[PDB]
């Protein structure tokens, strides 16, 4: 029979770097109905966002 004892100390020094590039499109919509005592309106909107 045999017994083994072991100790281990590890020093790990690590580097990392990164880039990233995002390209974002977007198409918005809107409708609106306004009402008053005597004033009524309506509105339609649309939006085109690049990024």
């Amino acid at each position: 029979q045999s017994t083994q004892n072991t100790d281990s100390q590890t020093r790990t020094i690590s580097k990392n770097t990164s880039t990233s590039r995002t390209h974002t499109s977007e198409v918005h919509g809107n409708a609106e109905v306004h009402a008053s005592f005597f004033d009524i309106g309506g509105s339609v909107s649309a939006g085109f966002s690049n990024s």
């Binding site: 974002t24 977007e26 918005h28 004033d39 966002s49």
Partner: peptide, 23 residues
Amino acid sequence: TQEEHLKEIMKHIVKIEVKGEEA
């Protein structure tokens, strides 16, 4: 110019909306 003044007060009666970005 009374009609023009009334139109101006009607325009004031409201909001020029907001500028929102959803990017």
